[PDB]
Amino acid sequence: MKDFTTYLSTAPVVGLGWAIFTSGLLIEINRFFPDPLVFSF
């Protein structure tokens, strides 16, 4: 597991994990909530 998780920790996988996390977060915000323009609570 150590030998594989060392590869898992390199930049291309980090280039996915942050990308998947932030992308999916923005998809769920734009999905459950409609498209707004004003931050009036």
Place this chain on the structure above:
Amino acid sequence: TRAGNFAPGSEPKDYLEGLPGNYNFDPLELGKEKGTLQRYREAELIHCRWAMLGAAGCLAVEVLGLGNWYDAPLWAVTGDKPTWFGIEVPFDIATILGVEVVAMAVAEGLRNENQDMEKRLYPGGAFDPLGFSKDPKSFEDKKLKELKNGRLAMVACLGFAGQHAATGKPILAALGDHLSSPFFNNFATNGVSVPG
């Protein structure tokens, strides 16, 4: 000096020997340290004394036929004259609450600055004007009696709360129900105390 066993053949604990009301009851090693044990003893004493006060308040209001204990604080909702022993005290609800909070705040303030572990259980002196505690045998006997009557007062107060949660009838009506129809009307026939 054990007063009995809560279970016949119970495993004896190494801490419940020199305490009043000792039955080795503690099943889950609560208060294993002495510093927590003394605080737990003091807190159990305070709950038992307040339970005696509550049981007396809920019983003298009913053996004298002056109303129900749950119906007593309803005067703050409807807004009529409060009544204690048929005297009709004219104090406002805000006034009695405001004097109550400061009065027992000062009372528990003088209770809290004791700094003596033995003084946090039984004060003596000014709180013991009649003074039947001069001899140690009667002192230990009365300690045991106080703790036992307080424990049953505590479970009686919790029974009052549960019984009023289930049925609207008071303690005396519940006693009449058990004396009239014990098998046909009890806690099992409510349907809200137990499911099904």
Place this chain on the structure above:
Amino acid sequence: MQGNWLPGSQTPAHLKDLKMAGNFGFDPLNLGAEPQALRWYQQAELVHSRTAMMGVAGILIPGIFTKLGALNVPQWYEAGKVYIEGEGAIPFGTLLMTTLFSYAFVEGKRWQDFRKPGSQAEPGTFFGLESQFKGTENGYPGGIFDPLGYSKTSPEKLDELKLKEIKNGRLAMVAFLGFAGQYGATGKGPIDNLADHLADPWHNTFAENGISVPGLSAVEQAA
């Protein structure tokens, strides 16, 4: 050791030199290799047998009196509904609450005595009468449970009494299992089934009824 559950079978090593009434080497799964497990399972089998002995007594003797016509008592499988529907009926919730509370009080004493044998004789516990509640042997408390005094005899009579008790208890347990199976299969009481087997032995058979062995009736109609 006396007899054998299966003559010629290999005996487990934990029952060869065991001193216990009714030991026949019946443990192919070796569930009682541990001595504490053996003690717990002995107590469990003892209480199961005792409750089954009351069960088959209350099933058979009122059934025999019904067959003789002395009493109008009903069958065991429908006795619950005819008591629930009666006018002097304690409610079912109250009944099982009372039963659970009383038997929990009994079985707490039983468990606390099983943990430490003879530890229930601590003075000033059960209002002074607990001094005879000490256990002489695991599963056999004695005391007020034997007031007439047949257990205060020679030991060679006592193990025979234990053997008779455990044998009639196992007979009662398998009889209650048979009662449940016969009610689930035929829908009648043990007295009716016994009368039918005595009158018509071949026609009143478990193989004739299709509940016990499904698919056997289709073979009979095919033949």
Place this chain on the structure above:
Amino acid sequence: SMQGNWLPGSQTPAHLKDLKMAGNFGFDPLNLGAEPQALRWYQQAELVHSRTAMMGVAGILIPGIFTKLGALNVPQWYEAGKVYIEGEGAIPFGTLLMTTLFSYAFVEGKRWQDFRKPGSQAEPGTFFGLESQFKGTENGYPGGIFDPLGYSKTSPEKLDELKLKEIKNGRLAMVAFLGFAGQYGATGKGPIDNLADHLADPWHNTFAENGISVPGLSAVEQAAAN
């Protein structure tokens, strides 16, 4: 020293282990109080956030409690600004905000200059001769005229007990005010009405039941009901 722990089993920061503090529980996972007088500045920030939160919460509950008892007709805290301003004895909002800002700047200017140099406000002939008692004996604990009853000139073991009682009731009122704004934001009612609703009906009156705090959870309830 160390008393209690905010999270048993968690790794305590090195700057919080042997530190003599009021109400220290090791609660600094972000290591913001690593530097020493940086923690002194944030100690004063915690003390001064809590002290105005104590007065703010007491100004919300005690008038709110007396409103429930019917002694006073004091309105709720969220609408109290519009109640006073629309009244016929109202100081204008611009005058009130300027007076509050001017008075606090003078007060917090003395508090600030006390922090940079401790005891610097005790210079003679500055505050008309009464500044001799304006010397802070401890950072965030000035004393002097602020303790006229002599309730701090006691045994040292009672002083940190009072300091621990101050920070504990201070933090408790401080999360209370966040609850007060959140409960007005979600339910639109005062804390007294919210407390009575939870006491009389606990299950149906919950922040999870209200859809404002947790959006979309009411749709889960509606989908499960259908």
Place this chain on the structure above:
Amino acid sequence: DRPLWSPGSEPPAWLDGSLAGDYGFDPLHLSEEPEMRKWMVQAELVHARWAMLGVAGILFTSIAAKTGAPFPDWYDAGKEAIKTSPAPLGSLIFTELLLFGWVETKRLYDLRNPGSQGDGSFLGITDGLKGKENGYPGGLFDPMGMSKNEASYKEAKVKEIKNGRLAMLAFVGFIAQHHATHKSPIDNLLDHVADPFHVTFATNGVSIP
């Protein structure tokens, strides 16, 4: 020296047989690091215990439904439970979330530092709430049990992990043949006993096109 998951296989080096139910089945090389080995042991134990609890509850409810008592199916039981439950949805899940978060970070920081909660921080108990083994606590959670004896404790550990794995298999079987048959597991069992030669996983239409 031990019965493996496949006879003649090579057991992993990190699986030396010192764990409960250590049959040496690990082709994906998980739990290789000792910290993750402990985390996998904890996760297997808690998933196993919850699988057994859920399977036992499902079986009890289905048996009670089959005997004539009014009980729901193992599926959509909560859907018809909430409409009669005094506790509504939302508050119930959040209450259980807060309480289980308390218990689970308590046991989590016990897993990170063994004996961390045995200092009396929680209501002044020291012997209780202290982990005896990797995924096995002590004090309050062993009221009468025989974990004091080492051999009986090891046998109970093996029995617990084997029953847990059997319960995981039971739960996946439950969801699979519920999606296959839309009936209770006890109903499926009675159908299998009634007609074993025809009623099976093959003649249900779905899952065999």
Place this chain on the structure above:
Amino acid sequence: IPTFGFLYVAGYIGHVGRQYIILSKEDAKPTDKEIILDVPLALKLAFQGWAWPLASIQELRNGSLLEKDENITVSPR
């Protein structure tokens, strides 16, 4: 309000990048740490960056945020 909303997250990323750069530089062959990320320290710093402006202000006053140009590579003009 979106101005301060973005700046909070923008300062969040800048702060956690700075702390990771500082932490990795006090380690043997720090160039490998940029291409071989470590998860527990980066995730710990990711969840310890909520108070980024509070860490930024205290480092600004005391010189840990900035660096005097006597150890800074400067152009030879």
